[PDB]
Design a protein around this ligand. Structure first.
Ligand SMILES: [Mg+2]
Ligand SMILES: [Mg+2]
Lengths: 108, 54, 165, 49, 142, 58, 48, 103, 350, 157, 146, 97, 49, 40, 266
RNA sequence: CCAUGAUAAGGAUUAUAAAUUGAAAGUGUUAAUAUCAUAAUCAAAAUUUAUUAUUUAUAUUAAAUAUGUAUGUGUAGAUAAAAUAAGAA
């Protein structure tokens, strides 16, 4: 069948047991997001920092289709900022002498 | 006018109605040729022996 | 000023030289060019918006001509105008149709090559299956509606429909 | 008869209506257009003769 | 739509009072087509140039059996008056006839000779509610 | 601007009044452009192929 | 879902599913196809 | 083809393998007109005038249609009796019988 | 020009994906492919060139091409000896070796830690960015028959996007083989990605002073009136004009009289007509293509057929149509087209 | 017909097919129509060769020919109905109820975008977008830039 | 496939050069011109044919030809792949439940049980048919190898 | 097209439509390379001839490169014919200087 | 001007930064949007049913 | 020429500056220790 | 009990074949065994069906001018038709006749493949306008009624697959079909080349080429509908010789050869 | 014409830092209940509908045909919108 393609190759994980630690469970009046992680948002911005995703040159991220979130165009691999620039590049920069605009008008 | 042979019936007389285009495994529509004028063992009823012919 | 436009033929000058208007007629013969006789000399107006680097909308070319009355009606407009043939309109005409696969191939052809047979549309199949299901319990909430009625009204010589109860 | 002649459709049901399973294969980008280059037995024979 | 005055009553939604781009409203309903102007008489709702030919619709184009009404963009010609032949136009409820021929019509399109929205109202095409609403606006007496 | 020789013509007016009191009309109906009419309105901006707006003919 | 079926080329919810290739994987050709080379048809037109 | 991990264990080639490029490219024909050979010259007189079925056809703007226009005129004139085209009126000729045609 | 800035042929391949990284990685793939294939071709060409540099003869034909001038810069027919010509040839081949070497040497720069395919100094072919196609769709998310306000308040923005990379390869010569590989990359392209091929090549055109002669402006000028709308369809022929290559010799005429009338040297007129030694009256002759006085087809002066003494059919007057049509060698229907008056009055031309 | 054995759930989808044929008729009639218009309305002389009484005569001859062409498609495009190839929902083009590059109505665009069928990208509902050109001058400017790369970058011959 | 066939595709380029060079193409042996004409009919086509070569009638006719010669294996429309290839376990965990991120149809010779693990010549000593269960299968695979 | 419009009944008309969308053939030459001795020893394009060339082809010259874009016919072949013709016709007229 | 001045005379950065010259405020007109009357801030008329 | 270029398969044409696949990308994701010095 | 749309119908194919052919079982479409198609309509019913389905222009519509009813009812009001003799008194008759509906072959490309300005689209292929028999377009007889029913009617019974076929047609479909259904080699091996209506045109071309007018000759060659005789190609190339035009001689030859049946190979 | 599904609108207390002032509770068109009927735009057309920001006094109808009506002391009752590159405590 054409549909023979859409079978499950592997046995899917069963639901054996209870809701996870600090699950959203709603009592008499509760405003509940299934979406927001209960434990990792409660954790202070001072400590964890404003980052939603790893701090990496953004070319590695893609704005997802159908999901409000970004993903990495190489699954899960990450290259640090240091790998975008030349070795020991001041403020990782193609060349250390000037900022982008400085480079433009020097060139002109 | 119409009757059991002509109408759409899932079942006729307690057994699956062979007259419905949708009561057959679609594979039965796939094209085939008439055998019968060929040599006995080439025919399709002997298919289990076909790998063996001489 | 209101003046008569004027032209000095080179034979009359105290040095022959090629007059710009004459050149203009050359250019009109080469790339065949309509010379609008009634074009008012006073009406030169560049399109400020697109032709001046001072506006954010600056394309460098005169996007529109600034003539208030100008309309699709006029022979002049008709003469410089892009015909609809092979534009996007044609592309819509062909690719945007109710069952997109009927753009790529005859359904019957496909069906007969892939499946052994023509297949009804999904909708039709639904009505078919339903008739079969509900003909199995109740009978005679029905009606007999055909395209051509003669086949039922005079049935063939044989054809004795099985009585039902 | 031919054992590669094989059902491409499922048994007709409401599962074709109520589900987003596709009714045909998606086109295969890297499969070339089928075209005719080839000769008959008869033709090869004609050439040899 | 609320009331179906035609088939389309079933297919179309009003969408409240909705704005369309300039001079494209889906349905061309020319309420203004007869809108008197002495000084603009020859330029208003007529041909933009007086050297234009009369439209298609003043001519018999093919082999005809006959017509019921002529189109409303047909222009009234001295022969319309003189010949004494039926001149009909499709208006509502049914058809408007030019019965009483005048030269004052000549050279204008019948769009312009046929009042689209009459000051006359049928009380029998109106629901009791609609009649109420026409009394509020001070149209119908009551 | 080149003009046809022998034709009586006018020069662009220097005085504001000359522009203002002449018989130049205002745009009144919907407005047309011989190329741009094929892409209907600015809001319906018809595009046959999705080429970069900066695409450059070779 | 409907009487009109989805067309598997234009729908990202088919194309990018687990049964097909997601847009974040590396997009190269999967396998080559030699059809015309392996078994070739002789030309016979429908028209003479 | 020796790589047993190809899609299973997660190895996907970043560059399409030479052998595959060869197969792909060897399946389809090459168009003859892509080869671009002109050693004679340009044909000024005959080329754009060739037989109608295969003809050079003008496109887009109406200027480019000069040939066609001539033909459409010739044809039109031939088919269309003056006896009939007499009867087509201009608005001013019609309006001349209105009691106040000019102001 | 030298180095990066000059070439015989340029190909630009414009790749287009639905996602930016797709098109980026495709461009790396295709780029490395053309690097290898390019190096192979250009290396082959380079060995051919090095062999041609080492030595070779000269075509009789190439020598003939250097020696076709009526006058060279020094004001006389110039004799290039085969030596000089070989020297021109050699100089060009020198330049072609420099260019080949330049392409090859950039093919060998981009190693694994060091690869930068954006700068043209560091790689062949290189890659240029091209601004993405982005269309924004604005629409009502509501289905409401009742209120326009509620429709407007629900408005979504979504975009269609298309992303582009450009691959530039400039080559010092033209090879149909490279062109073939390049057209064929469309068969192994990445998933849901397409491409265009821009070509800019160099090609000899030929300006014929014979077909497009340079002559004085006409004795009568052309007005603005030959330029009305539809003047393009009515008042003008397509260029080039047809100038006759064949002329008939009048009775009293002689070689030099004919040459004088046609605007040639007598030598020219004899070369074009080489078959004929002598020219009798009423003989057909070939007009040397350089002639200054050649006539255009159908001069503006109408041929008139007077009725006069006609044929022996009358010896008084010409009468029937088929008669004059036999005289002028044309169809009777054409003859009737031209004359409206004589066709309406009667057919016996009363 | 007469609602016997209808294949599609909406009967009106067929109208969409009818529409296609309209555009086809226009391709068949546009050039012809427009030439007859231009030659008809021309007040200046046609040319050096055709002037005066001949021109007047030829004009009338042509518009007589154009009126005689039965079924010649003269209807302006903005007066043709836009109807969906999917659900046969209609919308006015140039309005927020019609979506131009997919050529579907708002209703279908919504349905198709939310259950993923179209591939688009969501952008903040309130601005101009990701696109540079739209960001500069809005709809009109982008409209212009499209004109510029379709036409003006060519110096025609 | 056999790669080196691509070389024949040089031929319509060489032929074009032979015309630029004034080598008459009809002095070529009858033999060679047969091989060349073949090579041509593999890769050369004109702009004419090219506009028409994708019509569905011709694609499906080619399929019909393949069907009468009983070779359907490679054709796209006409093959139904059935067998799925399971994941590889890790001793780093039995626990981790794997799931498929993507799916590709690739020839079975990439991963096939190593020749020393599987029984000796299978084609010759075993008659195998892949077929579908008739009975309703609650869970597990709908195909089995008989 | 390699994607979608590659293989079925629409491959033909889409192909043709691209080809007609692409009819334009750009013809370039530098005015530099036009200044060369002609077969007759006279310079083919001199200063005056160049001035006349520039005035005749107006916006069709830029950066000292003459560029004709031939769009007239549906097929590229015919546009190189057309373009080439216009070029020699324009040179023929400029050469009057 | 202030950013240029800082690239030119490095130490001059400290007064500048303290007087909040180098500091960038992020503010924008609201994006256009057809829901609002004026296209920006003003919601349309409301009536109780 | 040849469909698969000599440079690919011929060891005479082996490029000594090419490195294997694994090495560069392992080397790349390295984040060296940020406290290289006292004080900072 | 029985509701039909049509009372009676007829067979597409005739006695000799059918009476014997019936002993061989034919497989009908499994899901709808009985087929009543537009070939099977009676003459009357076909006429009626064919009038409808054409919006306003079409003869079905009461106000098109082709209506045969003497009376029509708008909202309970009965309107009597105005006969055409009467309509003409104020509305002049400018009617060219059927030739006005057909442009020449020369314009077929301007018009996207058509010669026919009628209201239905006209295909030059056999199948789209096929009734029982193969479709054939008369360029002399084109009427609004369209008796042979070869036009592509948008709304009739059975239309849909025809419309779909028309929208799938290849880039040269109209042109190719028009060209191959006329212009084909005779059963004797003779060329189609000699036709009575085109003869004087070929003569004129030859004549023009002998006087050495290459451009005028080529300009007439353009207007040729049918394959031109060998003599034309001879004349035309002979004309190319004295001025050395080679490109032109070659494009002439190549035009007449392997396009036009190799008239040019001589 | 009875003939189930599904996306709207609708501010009321997770705040300033390297940061968005628009929500799930469902607004015609979408997938298993059938057993009165061809109602669909390709022009030029007939106001009763809660749900809509119109130009207010120097100069005023030219191209698809495009609105003739209400000057009345900025004047009842009752209502609308906004803290966002602006300036409100
Ligand atoms: Mg609901
Ligand atoms: Mg209908």
């Amino acid at each position: 069948y054409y549909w023979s393609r859409y079978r499950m190759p592997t046995q899917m994980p069963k639901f054996d047991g209870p809701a996870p630690v600090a699950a959203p469970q709603s009592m008499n009046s509760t405003k509940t997001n299934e979406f927001i992680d209960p434990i990792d948002d409660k954790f202070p911005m001072s400590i964890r920092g404003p980052l939603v995703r790893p701090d990496v040159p953004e070319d590695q991220y893609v704005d997802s289709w159908y999901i409000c979130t970004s993903m990495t165009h190489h699954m899960g691999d990450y290259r640090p900022w240091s790998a975008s620039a030349p070795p020991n590049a001041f403020r990782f920069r193609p060349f250390n002498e000037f900022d982008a605009k400085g480079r433009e008008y020097v060139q002109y | 006018q119409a009757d059991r042979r002509t109408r759409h019936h899932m079942m006729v007389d307690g057994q699956i109605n062979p007259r419905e285009w949708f009561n057959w495994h679609p594979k039965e529509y796939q094209p085939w040729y008439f055998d019968r004028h060929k040599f006995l063992y080439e025919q399709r009823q002997y298919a289990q022996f076909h790998h063996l012919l001489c | 000023g209101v003046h008569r436009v004027g032209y000095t033929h080179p034979s009359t000058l105290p040095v022959p030289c090629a007059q710009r208007w004459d050149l203009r007629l050359a250019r009109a013969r080469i790339f065949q060019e309509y010379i609008e006789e009634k074009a008012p000399g006073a009406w030169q107006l560049e399109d400020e918006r697109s032709m001046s680097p001072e506006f954010k909308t600056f394309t460098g070319y005169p996007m529109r001509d600034m003539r208030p009355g100008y309309g699709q009606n006029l022979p002049d407009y008709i003469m410089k105008k892009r015909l609809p043939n092979n534009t996007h309109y044609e592309l819509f005409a062909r690719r945007d149709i109710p069952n997109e696969d009927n753009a790529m191939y005859g359904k019957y052809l496909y069906d007969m090559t892939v499946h052994g047979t023509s297949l009804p549309s999904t909708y039709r199949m639904h009505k078919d299956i339903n008739k079969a299901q509900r003909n199995d319990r109740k009978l005679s909430g029905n009606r007999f509606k055909v395209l051509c009625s003669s086949g039922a009204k005079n049935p063939p010589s044989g054809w004795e429909p099985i009585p039902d109860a | 008869m031919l054992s590669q002649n094989v059902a491409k459709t499922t048994v007709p049901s409401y599962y074709m209506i109520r589900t987003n399973l596709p009714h045909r294969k998606p086109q295969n980008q890297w499969e070339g257009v089928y075209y005719y280059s080839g000769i008959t037995k008869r033709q090869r024979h004609l050439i040899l003769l | 739509l609320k009331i179906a005055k035609s088939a389309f009553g079933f297919y179309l939604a009003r969408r409240g009072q909705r704005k369309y781009p300039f001079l494209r409203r889906p349905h061309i309903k020319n309420t203004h087509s007869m809108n008197p102007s002495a000084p603009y008489f020859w330029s208003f709702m007529t041909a933009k140039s007086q050297m234009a030919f009369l439209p298609e619709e003043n001519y018999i184009t093919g082999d005809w059996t006959g017509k019921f009404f002529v189109s409303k963009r047909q222009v009234y010609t001295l022969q319309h008056a003189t010949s004494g032949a039926k001149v009909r136009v499709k208006s509502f409820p049914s058809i408007f006839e030019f019965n009483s021929p005048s030269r004052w019509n000549i050279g204008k399109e019948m769009n312009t000779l046929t009042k689209p929205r009459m000051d006359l109202i049928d009380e029998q095409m109106l629901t009791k509610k609609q009649r109420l609403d026409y009394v509020r606006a001070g149209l119908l007496p009551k | 601007m080149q003009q046809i020789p022998g034709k009586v013509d006018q020069t662009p007016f220097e005085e504001d009044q000359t522009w203002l009191l002449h018989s130049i009309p205002v745009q009144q109906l919907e407005m047309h452009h011989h190329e741009k009419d094929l892409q209907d309105l600015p809001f319906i901006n018809h595009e046959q192929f999705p080429r970069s707006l900066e695409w450059n003919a070779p | 879902v409907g009487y009109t079926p989805v067309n598997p080329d234009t729908s990202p919810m088919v194309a990018y599913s687990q049964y097909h290739w997601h847009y974040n994987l590396p997009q190269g050709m999967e396998r080559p196809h030699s059809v015309n080379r392996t078994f070739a048809a002789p030309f016979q037109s429908n028209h003479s | 083809s020796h790589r047993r991990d190809y899609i299973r264990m997660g190895y996907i080639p970043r560059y399409t393998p030479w052998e595959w490029i060869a197969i792909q490219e060897a399946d389809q024909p090459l168009i003859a007109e892509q080869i671009r050979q002109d050693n004679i010259g340009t044909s000024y007189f005959f080329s754009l005038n060739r037989y109608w079925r295969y003809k050079a056809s003008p496109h887009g703007y109406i200027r480019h249609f000069e040939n066609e226009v001539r033909d459409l005129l010739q044809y039109v004139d031939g088919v269309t009796p003056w006896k009939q085209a007499q009867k087509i009126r201009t608005y001013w000729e019609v309006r001349s019988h209105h009691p106040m045609p000019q102001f | 020009e030298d180095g990066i800035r000059g070439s015989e042929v340029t190909y630009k391949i414009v790749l287009e994906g639905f996602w930016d990284h797709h098109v980026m990685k495709l461009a790396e793939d295709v780029c490395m492919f053309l690097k290898d294939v390019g190096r192979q071709i250009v290396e082959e060409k380079l060995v051919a060139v090095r062999r041609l540099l080492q030595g070779g003869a000269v075509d009789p034909e190439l020598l003939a091409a250097f020696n076709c001038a009526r006058a060279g810069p020094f004001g006389g027919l110039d004799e290039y000896d085969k030596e000089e010509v070989a020297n021109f040839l050699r100089s060009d081949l020198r330049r072609l070796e420099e260019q080949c070497l330049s392409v090859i040497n950039r093919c060998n720069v981009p190693v694994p830690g060091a690869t930068n395919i954006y700068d043209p100094h560091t790689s062949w072919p290189h890659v240029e960015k091209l601004e993405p196609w982005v269309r924004m769709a604005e629409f009502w998310t509501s289905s409401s028959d009742t209120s326009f306000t509620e429709l407007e308040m629900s408005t979504a923005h979504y975009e269609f996007r298309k992303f582009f990379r450009v691959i530039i390869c400039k080559l010092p010569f033209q090879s149909t083989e490279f062109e073939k590989r390049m057209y064929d990359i469309r068969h192994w392209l990445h998933r849901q990605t397409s491409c265009e091929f821009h070509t800019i090549y160099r090609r000899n055109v030929i300006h014929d002073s014979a077909v497009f002669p340079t002559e004085h402006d006409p004795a009568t000028p052309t007005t603005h009136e030959h330029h009305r709308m539809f003047s393009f369809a009515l008042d003008w022929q397509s260029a080039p004009v047809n100038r006759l290559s064949t002329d008939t010799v009048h009775e009293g005429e002689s070689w030099d009289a004919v040459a004088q009338r046609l605007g040639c040297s007598v030598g020219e007129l004899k070369d074009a007509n080489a078959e004929r030694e002598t020219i009798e009256a009423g003989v057909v002759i070939n007009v040397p293509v350089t002639a200054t006085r050649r006539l255009t087809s159908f001069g503006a002066t109408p041929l008139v057929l007077p009725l006069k003494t006609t044929s022996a059919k009358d010896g008084e007057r010409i009468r029937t149509w088929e008669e004059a049509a036999a005289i002028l060698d044309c169809t009777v229907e054409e003859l009737q087209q031209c004359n409206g008056h004589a066709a309406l009055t009667y057919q016996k031309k009363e | 017909m007469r609602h016997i054995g209808q294949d599609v759930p909406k009967r009106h989808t067929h109208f969409v097919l009818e529409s296609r044929l309209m555009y086809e008729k226009s391709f068949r009639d546009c050039w012809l129509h427009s030439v007859c218009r231009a030659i008809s309305q021309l007040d200046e002389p046609l040319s050096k060769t055709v002037v005066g009484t001949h021109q007047k005569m030829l004009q009338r001859k042509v518009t007589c020919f154009q009126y005689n062409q039965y079924g010649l498609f003269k209807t302006p495009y903005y007066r043709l109905a836009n109807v969906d190839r999917y659900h046969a929902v209609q919308g006015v083009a140039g309005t927020r109820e019609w979506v131009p590059y997919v050529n579907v109505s708002y209703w279908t665009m919504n349905k198709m975008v939310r259950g993923g069928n179209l591939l688009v990208h969501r952008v903040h509902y309130t601005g101009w977008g990701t696109d540079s050109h739209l960001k500069k001058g809005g709809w009109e400017h982008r409209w212009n830039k499209v004109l510029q790369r379709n036409v003006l970058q060519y110096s025609r011959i | 496939a056999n790669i080196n066939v691509v070389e024949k595709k040089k031929v319509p380029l060489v032929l074009a050069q032979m015309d630029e060079l004034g080598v008459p193409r009809t002095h070529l042996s009858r033999v060679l011109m047969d091989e060349v004409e073949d090579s041509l009919r593999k890769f050369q086509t004109y702009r004419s044919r090219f506009y028409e070569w994708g019509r569905a009638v011709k694609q499906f006719d080619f399929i019909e030809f393949r069907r009468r010669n009983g070779w359907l294996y490679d054709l796209h429309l006409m093959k139904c792949t059935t067998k799925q290839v399971g994941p590889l376990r890790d001793f780093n965990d039995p626990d981790a439940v794997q799931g498929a991120v993507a799916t590709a149809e690739i020839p079975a010779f990439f991963n096939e049980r190593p020749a020393w693990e599987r029984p000796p010549l299978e084609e010759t000593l075993y008659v195998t048919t892949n077929k579908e269960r008739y009975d309703d299968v609650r869970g597990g695979d709908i195909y089995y190898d008989d | 097209d390699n994607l979608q419009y590659k293989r079925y009944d629409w491959q033909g008309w889409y192909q043709r439509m691209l080809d007609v969308h692409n009819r334009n053939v750009s013809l370039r030459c530098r005015i530099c390379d036009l200044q060369r001795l002609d077969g007759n020893g006279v310079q083919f394009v001199d200063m005056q001839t160049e001035r006349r060339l520039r005035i005749l082809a107006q916006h069709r010259v830029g950066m000292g490169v003459l560029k004709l874009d031939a769009d007239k016919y549906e097929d590229q072949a015919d546009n190189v014919t057309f373009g080439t013709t216009k070029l020699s016709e324009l040179l023929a007229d400029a050469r009057k200087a | 001007v202030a950013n240029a001045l800082v690239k030119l005379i490095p130490l001059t950065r400290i007064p500048l930064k303290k007087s909040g010259l180098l500091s960038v405020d992020r503010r924008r007109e609201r994006g256009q949007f057809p829901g609002y009357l004026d296209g920006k801030k003003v919601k349309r008329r409301f009536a109780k049913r | 020429s040849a469909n698969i270029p000599r440079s690919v398969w011929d060891p005479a044409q082996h490029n000594p500056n090419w490195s294997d696949s694994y090495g560069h990308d392992i080397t790349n994701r390295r984040a060296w220790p940020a406290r290289k010095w006292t004080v900072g | 009990s029985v509701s039909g749309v049509f009372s009676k119908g007829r067979g597409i194919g005739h006695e000799a074949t059918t009476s014997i052919l019936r002993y061989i079982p034919r497989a009908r479409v499994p899901w709808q065994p009985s087929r009543f198609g537009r070939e099977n309509l009676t003459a009357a019913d076909m006429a009626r069906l064919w009038s409808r389905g054409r919006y306003r222009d079409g003869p079905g519509n009461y106000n098109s001018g082709y209506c045969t009813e003497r009376t029509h009812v708008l909202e309970e009001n009965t309107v009597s038709i105005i006969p055409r003799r009467e309509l003409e008194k104020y509305m002049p008759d400018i009617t060219i006749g059927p030739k006005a509906l057909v442009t020449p072959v020369s314009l077929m490309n301007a018009r996207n493949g058509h010669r026919v300005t009628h209201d239905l689209l006209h295909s030059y292929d056999p199948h789209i306008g096929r009734l029982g028999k193969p479709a054939v377009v008369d360029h002399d007889n084109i009427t609004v009624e369209d008796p042979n029913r070869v036009g592509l009617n948008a709304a009739t019974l059975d239309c849909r697959g025809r419309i779909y076929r028309w929208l799938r047609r290849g880039p040269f479909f109209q042109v190719d079909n028009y060209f191959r259904r006329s212009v084909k080699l005779n059963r004797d091996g003779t060329l189609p080349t000699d036709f009575v209506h085109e003869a004087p045109l070929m003569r004129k071309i030859i004549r023009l080429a002998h006087r050495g007018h290459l451009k005028a000759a080529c300009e007439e060659y353009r207007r040729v509908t049918t394959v031109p005789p060998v003599e034309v190609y001879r004349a035309l190339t002979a004309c190319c010789v004295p001025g050395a035009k080679l490109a032109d001689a070659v494009s002439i030859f190549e035009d007449g050869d392997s396009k036009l049946f190799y008239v040019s190979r001589d």
